[PDB]
Amino acid sequence: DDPVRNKILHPMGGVAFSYRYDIWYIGTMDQPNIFKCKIKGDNEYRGYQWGIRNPFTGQKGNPYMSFDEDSAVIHRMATLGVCVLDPTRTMSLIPAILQG
């Protein structure tokens, strides 16, 4: 029912994503059907390049400078996916006004 992402309204009020029926789990499967694939070891690289000051870590004075400007940028990145082993074990029912 989240109206920030769901923007198409249904004719009967509310967002159009409210009228969608999802049976995620049909029976038991002896293994996880839906799971969140995450890489072993890929912690997100917290990475700062900075100049003479670093406002995040709070470091005054830098021995190894990336560049010469009063800046500090954060770069973080994550490799991530999901996997549904048996999509036939999962029955959905979508309103057509979401246009597939």
């Binding site: 010469d68 400007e69 800046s71």
Partner: protein
Amino acid sequence: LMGGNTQGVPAERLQQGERFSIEFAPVEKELSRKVGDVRFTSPVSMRNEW
């Protein structure tokens, strides 16, 4: 011009022979970049014999 001058420097102050001297090198507070430099000097030698 740096010191708030909105009328200009006279033409008498930009003549040949006028010595110029370094004071300092200001930057902003925010997103500063590099300015300024450092000057040095060399010694010369003298001579006597026996």
